[PDB]
Amino acid sequence: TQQPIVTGTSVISMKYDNGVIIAADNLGSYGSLLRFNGVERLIPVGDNTVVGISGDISDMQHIERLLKDLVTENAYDNPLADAEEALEPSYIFEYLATVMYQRRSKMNPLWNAIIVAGVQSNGDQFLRYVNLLGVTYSSPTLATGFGAHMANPLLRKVVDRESDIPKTTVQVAEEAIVNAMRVLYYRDARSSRNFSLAIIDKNTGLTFKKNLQVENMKWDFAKDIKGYGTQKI
Amino acid sequence: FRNNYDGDTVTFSPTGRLFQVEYALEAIKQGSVTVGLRSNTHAVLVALKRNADELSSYQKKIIKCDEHMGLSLAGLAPDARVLSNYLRQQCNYSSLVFNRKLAVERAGHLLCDKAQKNTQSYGGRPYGVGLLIIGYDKSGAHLLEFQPSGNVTELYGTAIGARSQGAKTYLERTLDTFIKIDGNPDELIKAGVEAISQSLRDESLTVDNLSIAIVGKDTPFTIYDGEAVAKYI
């Protein structure tokens, strides 16, 4: 049993007609101190999988090392490592899920919330969540921590049920997700304005966008607000 | 000579040989014949079951390791039980942890390494049994030949056991023919029985004497014995 120290906030994601999108800001908080700003919390694995991680950063870096090894190990005595026998997103997930549950069962968890996003070899979209308790679930949209309360409601207005997936384009989806990141910057006290976004499309492959920023914010109305009730100036 | 260098697997002879390993290989030759062959859609195992008395049963020679994998044995039955059991666990592990079916080529590597340990340390003994592994995985149909020495090879077809050489030459001849028996299990099986009968001499394959197993594209590894093989005699 431990307690997180340096932490990463929300990880939001959703699936669209041809793939899945996933995003996370670049902050590594230390309590109320927004200590580290160049933290990448999106881990690509191969070119069909991106693992988004929130929670304790030291454990994230540990999950990172585990993922690199999985790739190395898969290559060993595998003439099809970059073909029929390459790592599928579901393999990556089942592995992590297994570890998360073993660690909680030993009363020494990896203090994180993870979202594995990607495209299976047969084109299917893959989006599943696993956390420090080893709990797992899938939904057209998935978010961790704060984004679970604020992002999901927005994203779900685009893809409310399975049948909405084929009707959702990369444009619409990336837009929803970019807006969600802004909203989170508005109400989440542990969020950063900078973030990374990644798309895994069964046709265009993996697109990893770094150094994005929340833009087009509304703050002007702040000037019209004074006092907290009766004050006039 | 030999007598001074064959008291245990940990000793090399003056010419670089490992007699205990070789004596183990001898147990295979004394074993009943079994054949294996594959097209591009299926893999088949045909094995001649041997009986003690005419009041005894014909010892089973085929073992299923998973829904997509299985093997045939020639030699010490107990050792096949151990090795197949280990193969069953390895397949099970791959599924539970990575939600991935174990590659036939990977299974081969695992068997080789388990057999090798029993040829370099004092106290143990080499396994005294030969195995023919067939399975359908992410790269199609496969056939493997396992020797107690720890040597495992992938082939289109082969046979091990007493008089195995008959069937082996037949297959090495019929190659271009059966390798194209795609989408037609019955034809592949018949070709298997025709190769195995090339090693007969004593009797002729009967109903409670013949044992066949198949796996492929849309065929989970299944075993046929008795009445079920009647239509092939």
Curated annotation (Swiss-Prot), chain A:
Transmembrane segments: none annotated. InterPro entries: Ntn_hydrolases_N, Proteasome_beta4, Proteasome_bsu_CS, Proteasome_sua/b, Proteasome_suB-type. Keywords: Cytoplasm, Nucleus, Proteasome. Its main location: cytoplasm. It is found in: Cytoplasm; Nucleus. GO terms for cellular component: cytosol; nucleus; proteasome complex; proteasome core complex, beta-subunit complex; proteasome storage granule. CDD domains: proteasome_beta_type_4. One of its GO terms (biological process) is proteasomal ubiquitin-independent protein catabolic process. The keyword Calcium does not apply. Present with 16900 molecules/cell in log phase SD medium. The 26S proteasome consists of a 20S proteasome core and two 19S regulatory subunits. The 20S proteasome core is composed of 28 subunits that are arranged in four stacked rings, resulting in a barrel-shaped structure. The two end rings are each formed by seven alpha subunits, and the two central rings are each formed by seven beta subunits. The catalytic chamber with the active sites is on the inside of the barrel. Interacts with CIC1. Belongs to the peptidase T1B family. PANTHER family: METALLOPROTEASE TLDD (PTHR32194), PROTEASOME SUBUNIT BETA (PTHR32194:SF6). This is Proteasome subunit beta type-7.
From Swiss-Prot, chain B:
Keywords: Cytoplasm, Isopeptide bond, Nucleus, Phosphoprotein, Proteasome, Ubl conjugation. Its main location: cytoplasm. The proteasome degrades poly-ubiquitinated proteins in the cytoplasm and in the nucleus. It is essential for the regulated turnover of proteins and for the removal of misfolded proteins. The proteasome is a multicatalytic proteinase complex that is characterized by its ability to cleave peptides with Arg, Phe, Tyr, Leu, and Glu adjacent to the leaving group at neutral or slightly basic pH. It has an ATP-dependent proteolytic activity. The 26S proteasome consists of a 20S proteasome core and two 19S regulatory subunits. The 20S proteasome core is composed of 28 subunits that are arranged in four stacked rings, resulting in a barrel-shaped structure. The two end rings are each formed by seven alpha subunits, and the two central rings are each formed by seven beta subunits. The catalytic chamber with the active sites is on the inside of the barrel. Gene3D superfamilies: Glutamine Phosphoribosylpyrophosphate, subunit 1, domain 1. The modification Phosphoserine is found at residue 13. GO terms for biological process: proteasomal ubiquitin-independent protein catabolic process; proteasome-mediated ubiquitin-dependent protein catabolic process. It comes from Saccharomyces cerevisiae (strain ATCC 204508 / S288c). InterPro entries: Ntn_hydrolases_N, Proteasome_alpha, Proteasome_alpha-type, Proteasome_asu_N, Proteasome_sua/b. One of its GO terms (cellular component) is proteasome storage granule. There is a cross-link at residue 190 (Glycyl lysine isopeptide (Lys-Gly) (interchain with G-Cter in ubiquitin)). Present with 7210 molecules/cell in log phase SD medium. Belongs to the peptidase T1A family. It is found in: Cytoplasm; Nucleus. This is Proteasome subunit alpha type-6. The keyword Iron-sulfur does not apply.
